């Protein structure tokens, strides 16, 4: 993968939250990488609609750019 440009991207949507919570929703959304889908992964996030927001974005770009590498 190219985690230069990764750790670059996630900074760039993580900068949108305003707060620590989401932050890490984000974070950890990015860092989906085995068997389950974003949409598998996000549906035990249970923290409400800012934090499976942060969590599905930032997922679907790590996704997007491991699968570009
Ligand atoms: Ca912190
Ligand atoms: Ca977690
Ligand atoms: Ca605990
Ligand atoms: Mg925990």
Avoid: M, W
Avoid at 37 to 61: K, M, S, W
């Amino acid at each position: 993968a190219n985690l230069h440009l990764l750790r670059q991207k996630i900074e760039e949507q993580a900068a949108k939250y305003k707060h620590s919570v989401p932050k890490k929703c984000c974070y950890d959304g990015a860092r989906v990488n085995f068997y389950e889908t974003c949409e598998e992964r996000v549906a035990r996030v249970t923290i409400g609609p800012l934090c499976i927001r942060a969590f599905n974005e930032c997922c679907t770009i790590a996704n997007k750019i491991r699968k570009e590498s």
